[model samples]
Target: LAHSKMVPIPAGVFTMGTDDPQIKQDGEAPARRVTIDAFYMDAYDVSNTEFEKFVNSTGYLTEAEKFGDSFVFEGMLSVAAAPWWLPVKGANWRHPEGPDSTILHRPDHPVLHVSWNDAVAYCTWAGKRLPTEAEWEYSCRGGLHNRLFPWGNKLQPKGQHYANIWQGEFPVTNTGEDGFQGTAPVDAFPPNGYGLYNIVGNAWEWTSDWWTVHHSVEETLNPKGPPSGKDRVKKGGSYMCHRSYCYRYRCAARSQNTPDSSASNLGFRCAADRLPTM
Candidate 1:
């Protein structure tokens, strides 16, 4: 997309992580407070419709296109190899499910099958850049401190689905109780306190920082992860996240992937310095 709706995240201090046992892993553990400067973040994940504009403008191809096939959730391909991930032939952002499948009218759905490198290229073209893991967590917090999801610690507050996460079962019977079995619309759920929608689920957002197992506990100003690493960080767990298996939909939960890896549920948002339009 040429330009996206970005919300200004104010400068403030936030506890970066919590106990590993409370979450799904250890990378987000050893809670520490970090101050973050004000910056801009995409109000919503970059959608397929919006991404089409970028592709149409630059005649660029996504990482999935280069490989000719990307990992698709087994169920999406009319239902299992690897139990969850399936290397479908001819599956790209456009061909979400297979070569025969097309985006068609579902324009608001977030563009998937995007790698970290592909996400970087898209943000660069859009006059934006990928936010660091610190910035992403800060914005995703939505002004609230150390809660489970953006809304609160409760996964389903008031028995309502605040985010589009897996419902009935993992990788098998989704049941679509959360109003979505696969990726939901960019604005499918309510926005956080910062007016940013779907910050917790729907897509795994790429961060500019490298992936690291150990984070410095010392309070620092704008932590930019490690200088170098094998994989890139991805935040905001996708629709595949289920409490039964992958409970990474939490705000502090962190995951990573190789730069060239692409999947149907992996996508990203954009950020900017003070103002790009200026």
Candidate 2:
């Protein structure tokens, strides 16, 4: 299937890292300035229905399907165990929680359990590419500088939940106070200033850069992470995020995972370079 909704991001610079002393996250220290070229990005995360079209057209097997197992949040497990994640067999994008689950009612939800390779393949087929780490952060910020989230400094501005994040006790129980306990529609919330939706929560989106311990001291234009690393960068956070636990739903926050790792909270959006004539 082809994607039609995309937002044009003008070239600009912004402070790319975080310096919040209290909630200092690893690799986010010494916030640096970064400038990025203009680009176009998907207005929303690729949905299950969109992925299904790719699967039907190419019959491509995702890493999870080939391995026959993928990580699922333990809180979603009927048995409820420790470690927070369990390797459940048959847990691909189709069955996010294992064989017992299905994308029956979540066709519009972002496709989960997709590895970096899977995301890249989808992008290749769509004639697009994953945004670089710098581009991802810049676009996610939506022209806002150093804000905690896409909208503004507060997680819930004006006493309203803007993104889909875990509410109440983490892992053990979810209050679903934000209208969803798991993934929500790709366009569930109000868009950012750039007219992009769900840039903070819903699911962590992959970026086209490797992971590093910290930002480089010498700032550069369109910095694409390190030359090589074990894990790739993933931005935004997921519905599993809670302030008490993973408070990475903020714009400057980042996390990493092995390129082959697939989880129920992992997905991606596509980006493309601006046309030369533009």
Candidate 3:
């Protein structure tokens, strides 16, 4: 199996990041200048069918399976529970919830419990790379300048669902107001202004940056991130995000997690620069 082909995006400038009055995160502070070169990006986040093929051909082991465990929401664990990993040993991309679970019924959902390393392995195998934070946010704005969401300010303008996110309660009760309780199949929603699917929710996608934004204030050309940092960026939010709780489901919203950590809510997409000769 070979890597997916590239779709070239012409080089341009769109306002990156935001200053939404409704959300709060320090890394996105000093919301300022950023620039990116035209590059190729995945039309959709890598799907289960695609990831499974990669594993079958490469014999790759995701970090979740390697570590023998991944993070489930603390709330999902009983408050009386002592060890989080208890009652779940095989909770991974293949089994999702644990040994009793299987991906047999979910052939379309995005693969879960994948760490940054896992995503990089797949993208590298595919001959692509993760997008830089700049390129990602630039693409995410969906050609719209400074809008709150990829679509616009309204979350469900005129009462239409654009992406899959928690609507009711957190960690326990899901109202399924967005038409998804667990992971929705890839391409389950309408494409944004850029014809990209699930960029604001569904799963948190990884970027190439090493989690330092000091350089974000100054305009950069193809910035790859800090030389050294403690965390990596996770964007677009996920099914775990809710308005009252995880407000990270907004377009400009971003979060950081150690590159080695894997969770049910995290996933990734790939990007590549257009070759100068071609």
Candidate 4:
């Protein structure tokens, strides 16, 4: 696990926020110039197959399992509603939907119902760590700037989808036009300019940064985040994203959740300080 398939994100100055203007997403506004060092990022989201290896090797149980439940059935807003993110009994990574659903045929999908702490543990065991917020945005830009998405401003140019976001109306219908309504295979779409897959949508990735809406435009050589905070930062949006509902699928968009929070639409990848030696 020390040497995962990672793309070397070139060190450069990045404008760390977006000005696209979305309600409740002002954290990404007033973009500022930032300097970041080069780092290696996972080529894709951590798949269930990879997490299986970690669990099987160490016999480590996730926080969700220890808590007796995790957030699942988020997009299924037909019954009880349950705030769409409340904990559902028996909804751990092994059972992403609820007690009835399992990762039987979707092992290739990204492992969900994992909290920030769970993601940290997995990456820690793998000799890696979560990407800093600066690094996440810098690399997620895919060597490009001023673009809303990894590809470009358009969500789907020429009527071709590049992400796994909700296809139809949110909470009511999903046309499945993008070949998947739920989680798709890790490499289900074209990679970004840095050869990373699903960088903008599909599942929200955890960042090492703490929750903060206040930011100083001052330049920092490798910004981690605030010294201490309550919730961790979540990035890249999720498959449940919709333009009419949650238009945060942009690369610069950000959200926050407690360290103990686990949801079916939440997962993470790993980052490294250096590349693997041959």
Best of the candidates, lDDT: 2
Instruction: List where candidate 4 sits over 4 angstroms from the true fold.
Output: 1-3, 24-26, 74-82, 276-278
Measured on C-alpha atoms, candidate 1 has an lDDT of 0.86
Write candidate 1's Cα lDDT for 126-221 as tens digits: 899999999999899899988878998888889888998887766768888889888888977888999788899888999999998787689989
The CA lDDT at 100 in model 4 is 87
lDDT of 2 by residue, 12-128 (tens): 988888777224655877678888888899999999998988999999999999999999998776522348988898999999999999998988899999999999999888778
TM-score of candidate 3 against the unseen true structure: 0.89
Output the better candidate (1/3) by lDDT: 1
TM-score of each: 0.95, 0.94, 0.89, 0.94
List the candidate 2 regions with Cα displacement exceeding 4 Å: 1-4, 21-25, 78-82, 275-278
Each prediction's whole-model lDDT (CA): 0.86, 0.87, 0.76, 0.84
Error of 1 at 222 (Å): 1.3
Better of 2 and 3 by TM-score: 2
Candidate RMSDs in order? 2.2, 2.7, 3.6, 2.5
The clash number for model 1 is: 0
Model 2 TM-score is: 0.94
How far off is model 1, as Cα RMSD? 2.2
Judged by TM-score, which candidate is best? 1
